[PDB]
Amino acid sequence: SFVEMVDNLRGKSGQGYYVEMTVGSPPQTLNILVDTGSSNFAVGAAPHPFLHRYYQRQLSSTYRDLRKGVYVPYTQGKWEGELGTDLVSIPHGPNVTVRANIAAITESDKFFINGSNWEGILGLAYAEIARPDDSLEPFFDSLVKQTHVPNLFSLQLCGAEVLASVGGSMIIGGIDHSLYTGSLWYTPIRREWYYEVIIVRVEINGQDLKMDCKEYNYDKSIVDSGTTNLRLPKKVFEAAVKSIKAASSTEKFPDGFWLGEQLVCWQAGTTPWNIFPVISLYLMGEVTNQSFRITILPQQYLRPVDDCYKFAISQSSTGTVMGAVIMEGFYVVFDRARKRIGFAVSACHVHDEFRTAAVEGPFVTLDMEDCGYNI
Ligand SMILES: CCCCCS(=O)(=O)C[C@@H](NC(=O)c1cccnc1)C(=O)N[C@@H](Cc1cc(F)cc(F)c1)[C@H](O)CNCc1cccc(CC)c1
């Protein structure tokens, strides 16, 4: 938890958060997307219309070819590459250098984003979902094994021609107490592959969705910084929109809005936040029958793009995804050592005069264990 790591993240709305890193010798500078939703460290290693610079292996005296191809398909978008290792540093991170696995991207499809300003991706999740297989040690594992950095990192993602710029902090090796107020509440990491958690209850403006909690985690629920929106399984999505639509029936928007396709604008400064409800996601606590909740304001699920916004909540077919817009306003601790994820109100907390994002507990909930999907 260093003051030198504060504000070491940057990016544009809808295009994620990236941290500056150097690879090879001499140091090659690159902006790398911080993604707790995957486990491969990869960087553009060949020219591309959206890349202004890229990893040039031939210019690195410390590069070692692993002579193995690698391929990684995401929800939408994918890339192909060549494996190898090299020295990697995070200028605004811990003062150490480690030899890490790196997937030099040679071919890609709908992966890189035009104008995003990042040239690679840092999969911070576990080896289990790493490609080719789990023998390809993820970056953070190498960092912990090679240096004395504590097996833990925390993220503070903040809100907002060109798309609004965003800032944040990735504290490697610790917790920076000045980045949050109040208490930290932890939810167990159900399994060490994605950063899987369990949602046991959901409320829209204080009203219970009243669904079997297995639906909330239908398939799985993950904390994913590499994903923008709050993604919800079909049944949960529909209940959610119906509830949100009702609360804001005072005004009407085109179906494209709710489908997160087309934006919606209001006179600059007149956004009627008060008509949109708050969303409370209750997460399993560290104790049976006990949980805590994180409340999201409309300022979070209505992403800036007159003041224009897009509905940052969309239907998923691969489970719940607590994306960036959910993480924003909260200080999130990925306590790998103790297999848990802590949440707390962020210093750049979720605004508003009558309301505010919050992290509250405890709230008793029985049989939280049957909320998960049992393989
Ligand atoms: C951060 C910049 C914002 C980009 C806006 S986004 O549309 O929300 C990105 C999201 N896209 C969507 O969620 C999406 C996209 C289109 C339609 N519906 C949903 C997505 O796929 N995210 C990848 C990171 C990524 C970032 C990019 F910038 C471009 C890519 F290519 C990939 C996560 O790693 C996925 N974790 C779940 C997961 C799923 C499958 C396999 C794995 C094993 C690696 C893992």
Pocket (CB within 6 angstroms of ligand 1): 15-16, 33, 35, 37-38, 72, 74-77, 111, 113, 129, 224, 226-228
The residue whose CA is least distant from atom 4 of ligand 1 is: 15
Q: Which of 75, 80, 321 is the best mutation target for the ligand 1 pocket, counting ligand atoms within 8 Å of the beta carbon and taking the most?
A: 75
Task: Give the position, in ligand 1's atom list, of the atom nearest the Cα of 110.
Answer: 31
Adjacent-strand bridge partners of 21: 30
Task: Give the position, in ligand 1's atom list, of the atom nearest the Cα of 226.
Answer: 1
Q: Which of 70, 74, 163 is the best mutation target for the ligand 1 pocket, counting ligand atoms within 8 Å of the beta carbon and taking the most?
A: 74
Domains of the chain: 17-149 (2.40.70.10), 150-375 (2.40.70.10)
133, 224, 255, 307: the catalytic one is: 224
Q: Whole-angstrom Cα distance, residue 12 to residue 159?
A: 10
Ligand 1 centre to CA of 61 (Å) is 33
Q: Whole-angstrom Cα distance, residue 46 to residue 295?
A: 43
Ligand 1 centre to CA of 226 (Å) is 6
Cα dihedral 232/238/244/247 (nearest 10): -150
Omega before residue 26 within 30° of 0, cis: yes
Residues sharing a CB contact under 8 Å with residue 191, sequence separation 6 or more, in sequence order: none
Question: For residue 359, which of 225, 185, 209, 207 has the smallest C-alpha distance?
Answer: 185
Q: Are 30 and 21 in contact (CB under 8 A)?
A: yes
User: How far are the Cα atoms of 140, 236, 271 from residue 372, in angstroms, in the given order?
Assistant: 27, 15, 38
Q: How many CB atoms lie within 10 A of CB 225?
A: 29
**Is residue 224 annotated as part of the catalytic site, yes or no?**
yes
Q: Are 79 and 108 in contact (CB under 8 A)?
A: yes
Adjacent-strand bridge partners of 301: none
Question: For residue 8, which of 144, 122, 138, 141 has the smallest C-alpha distance?
Answer: 122
Nominal resolution in Å? 2.2
Q: How many CB atoms lie within 10 A of CB 88?
A: 26
Q: Are 84 and 64 in contact (CB under 8 A)?
A: yes
- Alpha carbons within 13 angstroms on the beta-carbon side of residue 265 total 6
Q: Whole-angstrom Cα distance, residue 252 to residue 195?
A: 37
The residue whose CA is least distant from atom 6 of ligand 1 is: 227
Ligand 1 centre to CA of 55 (Å) is 22
User: How far are the Cα atoms of 209, 297, 343, 344, 347 from residue 181, in angstroms, in the given order?
Assistant: 29, 17, 11, 7, 7
User: How far are the Cα atoms of 17, 183, 364 from residue 33, in angstroms, in the given order?
Assistant: 6, 28, 37
Task: Give the position, in ligand 1's atom list, of the atom nearest the Cα of 324.
Answer: 1
Q: Whole-angstrom Cα distance, residue 373 to residue 375?
A: 6
The secondary structure of the chain, three-state, reads: CCCCCCCCEEEECCCCCEEEEEECCCCEEEEEEEECCCCCEEEECCCCCCCCCCCCHHHCCCCEEEEEEEEEECCCCEEEEEEEEEEEECCCCCCCCEEEEEEEEEEEECCCCCCCCCCEEEECCCHHHCCCCCCCCCHHHHHHHHCCCCCCEEEEECCCCCCCEEEEEEEECCCCHHHEEEEEEEEECCCECCEEECEEEEEECCEECCCCCCHHHCCCEEECCCCCCEEEEHHHHHHHHHHHHHHCCCCCCCHHHHCCCCCEEECCCCCCHHHCCCEEEEEECCCCCEEEEEEECHHHHEEECCEEEEECEEEECCCEEECHHHHCCEEEEEECCCCEEEEEEECCCCCCCCCCCEEEEEEECCCHHHHCCCC
The phi and psi torsions of 264 (rounded to 5 degrees) equal -135, 135
Q: How many CB atoms lie within 10 A of CB 322?
A: 30
Ligand 1 centre to CA of 174 (Å) is 26
- Strand bridging mode 41-44 / 120-123: antiparallel
Omega before residue 277 within 30° of 0, cis: no
The residue whose CA is least distant from atom 26 of ligand 1 is: 226
Give the distance, in angstroms, between the CA of residue 140 and the centroid of all CA atoms in the same chain. Answer: 16
Ligand 1 centre to CA of 138 (Å) is 18
Q: Whole-angstrom Cα distance, residue 198 to residue 344?
A: 17
The phi and psi torsions of 223 (rounded to 5 degrees) equal -100, 110
Q: Whole-angstrom Cα distance, residue 4 to residue 93?
A: 7
Ligand 1 centre to CA of 256 (Å) is 21
Task: Give the position, in ligand 1's atom list, of the atom nearest the Cα of 111.
Answer: 31
- Cβ density class 51-69: b for 16+ within 10 Å, e for less: beebbebeebeebeeeeee
Residue 286, exposed/middle/buried by CB under 10 A (0-12, 13-18, 19+)?
Answer: middle
Residue 163, exposed/middle/buried by CB under 10 A (0-12, 13-18, 19+)?
Answer: middle
What tokens were used for 76?
């939408």
